[PDB]
Ligand binder design. Structure first.
Ligand SMILES: O=C(O)CNC(=O)c1ncc(-c2cc(-c3cccc(Cl)c3)no2)cc1O
Ligand SMILES: [Zn+2]
Length: 341
């Protein structure tokens, strides 16, 4: 019952439907729509305050970036080195390189490669000509090495609105802005992040499927010390119900964001992102903020994301107390077998 994005929106000027369901991939779980609201709507304000997702339609957060395409960026983004991830499949499973030492019998299926922006544009054009099925994804934090016109657009962002959001929520500093340029059909598999995220869509359309933190049991993340920490072990395209039985109980929140839309992805919320099939390249800029500090007085019962934080810290402490992350598993099983299960 994954009819969660509602009926496709009609573009202004009678330009037809922005998308159709044939461009969405099919999955085994039901979803329900994420609310699409105006930033002036108080309902959207209490959704963000209570850490629930919402699509804001009229923030003008990245208004100067809506003119961006591959040509404009190649001319103005500068000559810095851009992280580009390759893959032979539509799923871009990212991995922590610093944690690759803990798991030697782990081979990554999507390698990173730095390059110039013109090399990335060229590498895309070869694949389209060659008819190849290799897929690329540019994920690069913007810094000071960008050209003059790009800094013009960056300064043109609606900092008034997003800084006021940072203050009202007690969030920490803006950690980074990640520029995402992906091919059609590209998929970022389900994972969660430990920061608050404003997902500002620029070019193309992306389907975003979100799961609240209380569905930890249904999504089976890798061990904290695994390179794929915070990512789900479940193959959404071929779910192993024997290893992951509670994935049969997972329920999602779904929406399709287009140019001008801003999706609030609350901290610790799972998200599965896919660029719509046959929808052209996609461009996104997201804004990451450190969450509000833990309050002095602890209120019980704990929120679901607090229990996830407790589980992460236990795995972390266990890994350094034993001197080897590989012993975390056997000791945890020893602790519960015949005692808590
Ligand atoms: O595709 C879309 O539109 C949506 N993209 C996302 O949601 C998204 N979010 C967060 C991250 C991320 C990856 C890491 C990281 C990876 C490997 C090693 C190390 Cl050290 C750090 N940190 O953050 C990547 C993402 O793709
Ligand atoms: Zn993420």
């Amino acid at each position: 019952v994954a009819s969660g994005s509602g009926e496709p929106r009609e573009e202004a000027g009678a330009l037809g439907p922005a998308w159709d369901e044939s461009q969405l991939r099919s999955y085994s779980f039901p979803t329900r729509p994420i609310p699409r609201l105006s930033q002036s709507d108080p309902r959207a304000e209490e959704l963000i305050e209570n850490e629930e997702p919402v699509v804001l339609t009229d923030t003008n957060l990245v208004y100067p970036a809506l003119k961006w395409d591959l040509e404009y960026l190649q001319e103005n983004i500068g000559n810095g080195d851009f992280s580009v991830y390759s893959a032979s499949t539509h799923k871009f499973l990212y991995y922590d390189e610093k944690k690759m030492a803990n798991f030697q019998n782990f081979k990554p299926r999507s390698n990173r490669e730095e390059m110039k922006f013109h090399e990335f544009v060229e590498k895309l054009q070869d694949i389209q000509q060659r008819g190849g099925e290799e897929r690329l994804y540019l994920q690069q934090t913007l810094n000071d090495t960008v050209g003059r016109k790009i800094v013009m657009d960056f300064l043109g962002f609606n900092w008034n609105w997003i800084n006021k959001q940072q203050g009202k929520r007690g969030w920490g500093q803006l950690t980074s802005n990640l520029l995402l340029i992906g091919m059609e059909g590209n998929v970022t598999p389900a994972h969660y992040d430990e920061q608050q995220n404003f997902f500002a869509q620029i070019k193309g359309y992306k389907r975003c499927i979100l799961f609240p933190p209380d569905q930890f049991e249904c999504l089976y993340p890798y061990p904290v010390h695994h390179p794929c920490d915070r990512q789900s072990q479940v193959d959404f395209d071929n779910p192993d119900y024997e290893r992951f039985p509670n994935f049969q109980n997972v329920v999602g929140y779904e929406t399709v964001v287009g140019p001008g839309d801003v999706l609030y992805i609350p901290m610790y919320w799972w998200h599965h992102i896919e660029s719509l099939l046959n929808g052209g390249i996609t461009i996104t800029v997201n804004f990451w903020y450190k969450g509000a500090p833990t309050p002095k007085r602890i209120e019980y019962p704990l929120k679901a994301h607090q229990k996830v934080a407790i589980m992460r810290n236990i795995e972390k402490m266990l890994g350094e107390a034993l001197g080897n992350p590989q012993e975390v598993g056997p000791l945890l099983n020893t602790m519960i077998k015949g005692r808590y299960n």
